[PDB]
């Protein structure tokens, strides 16, 4: 059988491809002349899968879509403090107002706008880095997430460098205020080359997947960026990626994304998917007309919306078996606060101490809640509590005859766990032993420690 997702993409391409409104980027001859009859799309999954359709192997300059990647590198190369002092976090239109730098901050609004991107480039390696080191540091970060050595299309670079008065304007203003140190020409040159890096709809998908996983490369499993750094990048994509229309975009689509004037659109939905879309023509506000509509389709047909929750929940608890005197509690999935939290519910739901719990709510006041609670399997199916309820069960009819003396924690089925999970699950075990309960942790591939 053939995977049905790519067939969905092919249908979407054909349906939305029935028309092609808008225009190709006019302010740069090379892009205005590009072939408009192109439309491709790709989805890179968290686990390493790649679905596509249409022109998804056609290279094009990434332009603005490169902004979240250089921001990432700047954060790793200089640290938050140095970068935040130069780049802000507020949404705004690309139209520039000097008043935004007059603030006691003296820094452009965010990293998605040109002025902010020029400050990011300037920060790329260190204060004593040359023009060349910063350029390939840019090319390097994009290349490392794309999984292959990328190149700069000098034809576009030269084409744009000849009509770069606006960005030179932005760079000179930024210097007067001290956000740039080197020359306006030098920083603008590096950013224009940066925007000229060539990628395909599939490179973007994979690059976006790196951000969606929190920094881990989906095709290898190695960490390319620290999760805290990726969180900030996807955060700014959502609040500023679509400028003044971000509010409308978050609600109707709900996907962190950034478009580029060459037709490309980058998407990255944490924990679920990396998206790459390509369609030359732009709408009245500068984005890829079909590129963004296609994102809206993916969101409406699949509910791939940042506000549509998809958590591990109680499913972190694979099962709870009360063999006899000992209890077997197995865990699974990627454990973070979500799973760790449920785990703590399981452990606590065993009577390993005088059970004088704090319901939290007055049963007398909420008769409905008590009734619903009376059937824990039903309520657990309606919310999504996995096998956590098997804990109250083990401590149920089974405790009527015999106390629990040993608890085995098996983590074989667990893929990974962050520090938050580790510290929480650790504490839960520390408190078990305190109840005079034996606790043995069966962890084949030592994952538990910090």
Ligand X SMILES: N[C@@H](CCC(=O)O)C(=O)O
Binding residue for ligand X, selected from 56, 64, 211, 281, defined by CB under 6 A: 64
177 catalytic, yes or no? no
Q: Which of 19, 360, 400, 446 binds a second copy (CB under 8 A)?
A: 360
| 67 contacts 112 by C-beta, under 8 angstroms | yes
> Is 8 one of the catalytic residues?
no
**Residue that is written with structure tokens 């954060």 in the block:** 75
List binders of a second copy among 91-130 (CB under 8 A).
91, 110
Catalytic hit among 83, 261, 334, 343: 261
> Binding to a second copy by residue 250, rule CB under 8 A?
yes
Tell me the sheet residues that pair with 269. 273
* Nearest residue to 352 (alpha-carbon basis) of 411, 394, 387: 394
Q: Any binding-site annotation on 243?
A: yes
Number of residues that bind a second copy (CB under 8 A): 116
Chain residues 371-430 in contact with a second copy, contact rule CB under 8 A: 372-373, 378-388, 413, 415-416, 418, 420, 424, 427-428
Q: What distance in Å separates the CA atoms of residue 122 and residue 177, rounded to the nearest whole number?
A: 14
Reference 248, options 185, 291, 292; nearest CA is 292
To the query of whether residue 243 is one of the catalytic residues in this protein, the response is yes
Q: Per DSSP, which regions of 381-448 are E strands?
A: 406-410, 414-417, 438-442
Q: Which two tokens stand for residue 156?
A: 């576009």
What does the alpha-carbon distance between residue 398 and residue 375 come to, in Å, rounded to a whole number? 17
27 is catalytic: no
> Looking at residue 397, what DSSP letter applies?
G
Q: Which of 152, 348, 391, 395 binds a second copy (CB under 8 A)?
A: 348
Positive or negative: CA dihedral 389, 394, 398, 399: negative
Site for ligand X in 248-267 (CB under 6 A): 260-261
**Which SS3 state, helix, strand or coil, does residue 315 take?**
helix
Question: Which of a second copy, ligand X, none does residue 312 bind (CB under 5 to 8 Å by kind)?
Answer: a second copy
- Kindly state whether residue 90 participates in binding a second copy, applying the rule CB under 8 A: yes
Q: Which stretch binds a second copy (CB under 8 A): 29-37, 160-168, 345-353, 392-400?
A: 345-353
258 catalytic residue (yes or no): no
Q: Is 366 within any annotated ligand binding site?
A: no
In angstroms, the CA 93 to CA 216 distance is: 32
312 binds a second copy (CB under 8 A): yes
Pick the closest to residue 276 from 32, 17, 9 (CA basis): 9
The answer to whether 224 contacts ligand X (rule: CB under 6 A) is no
Interaction between residue 218 and a second copy (CB under 8 A) = yes
Length of the chain: 450
Instruction: Quote the least distance from Cβ 158 to a second copy, whole Å.
Output: 28
With CB under 5 to 8 Å by kind, the binding choice for 246 among a second copy, ligand X, none is a second copy
* Among candidate residues 433, 409, 415, the one with its CA nearest the CA of residue 346: 409
3-state secondary structure of 127: coil
What is the footprint of ligand X within residues 28-57 (CB under 6 A)? none
| Residue written as token pair 């929940």 | 313
Question: Is residue 92 within the footprint of ligand X (CB under 6 A)?
Answer: no
Only one of the segments 70-78, 125-133, 162-170, 235-243 lies at the binding site for a second copy (rule: CB under 8 A); that segment is 235-243
CA separation for the pair 265, 278 (Å, rounded): 6
154 CB burial (10 A radius; 0-12, 13-18, 19+): exposed
Looking at beta carbons only, is 86 or 156 nearer to a second copy?
A: 86
Binding-site residue positions for substrate: 64, 114, 160, 167, 191, 243, 261
Binding-site residue positions for L-glutamate: 64, 114, 160, 167, 191, 195, 261
Active-site residues: which are they? 64, 67, 191, 243, 261
Interface with ligand X (CB under 6 A): 63-64, 114, 167, 195, 260-261
Binding-site residue positions: 64, 114, 160, 167, 191, 195, 243, 261
């Amino acid at each position: 059988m053939r995977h049905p997702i790519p067939d969905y993409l092919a249908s979407l391409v054909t349906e939305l491809g029935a028309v092609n409104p808008g225009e190709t980027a006019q302010y740069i001859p090379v892009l205005a002349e590009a072939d408009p009859d192109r439309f491709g799309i790709a989805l890179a999954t968290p686990t390493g899968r790649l679905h596509c359709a249409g022109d998804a192997d056609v290279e094009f300059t990434i332009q603005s879509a490169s902004k979240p990647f250089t921001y990432a590198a700047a954060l790793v190369d200089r640290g938050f403090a140095a970068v935040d002092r130069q780049v802000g976090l507020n949404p705004s239109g690309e139209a520039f107002n000097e008043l935004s730098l007059e603030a006691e901050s003296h820094r452009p609004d965010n990293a998605m706008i040109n002025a902010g991107a020029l400050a990011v480039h300037q920060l790329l390696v260190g204060p004593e880095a040359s023009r060349k080191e910063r350029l390939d540091r840019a090319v390097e970060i994009m290349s490392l997430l794309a999984g292959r050595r990328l190149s700069v299309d000098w034809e576009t670079y030269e084409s744009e460098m000849a009509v770069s008065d606006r960005n030179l304007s932005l760079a000179h203003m930024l210097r007067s205020y001290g956000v740039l140190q080197d020359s306006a020409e030098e920083i603008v040159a590096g950013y224009v080359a940066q925007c000229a890096v060539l990628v395909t709809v599939k490179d973007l998908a994979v690059m976006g997947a790196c951000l969606a996983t929190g920094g881990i490369h989906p095709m290898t499993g190695e960490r390319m960026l620290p999760s805290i750094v990726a969180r900030r990048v996807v955060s700014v994509m959502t609040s500023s990626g679509m400028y003044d229309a971000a509010g409308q975009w978050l609600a109707d689509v709900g996907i962190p994304a950034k478009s580029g004037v060459a037709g490309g659109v980058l998407g990255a939905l944490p924990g679920r998917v990396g998206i790459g879309v390509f369609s030359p023509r732009l709408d009245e506000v500068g984005n890829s007309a079909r590129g963004v509509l296609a994102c809206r389709r993916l969101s409406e047909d699949f509910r791939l919306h940042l506000m549509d929750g998809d958590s591990l929940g109680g499913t972190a608890v694979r099962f709870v078996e009360r063999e006899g005197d000992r209890v077997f509690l197995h865990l699974q999935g990627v454990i973070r606060f979500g799973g760790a939290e449920a785990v703590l519910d399981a452990l606590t739901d065993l009577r390993t101490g005088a059970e004088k719990p704090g319901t939290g709510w007055d049963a007398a006041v909420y008769p409905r809640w008590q009734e619903a609670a009376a059937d824990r399997a039903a309520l657990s199916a309606a919310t999504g509590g996995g096998a956590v309820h098997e804990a109250a069960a083990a401590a149920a009819r089974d405790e009527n005859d015999g106390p629990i003396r040993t608890v085995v924690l098996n983590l074989a089925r667990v893929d990974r766990i962050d520090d938050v999970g580790r510290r929480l699950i650790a504490e839960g075990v520390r408190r078990l032993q305190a109840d005079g309960v034996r606790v043995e942790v069966e962890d084949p591939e030592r994952i538990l420690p910090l």
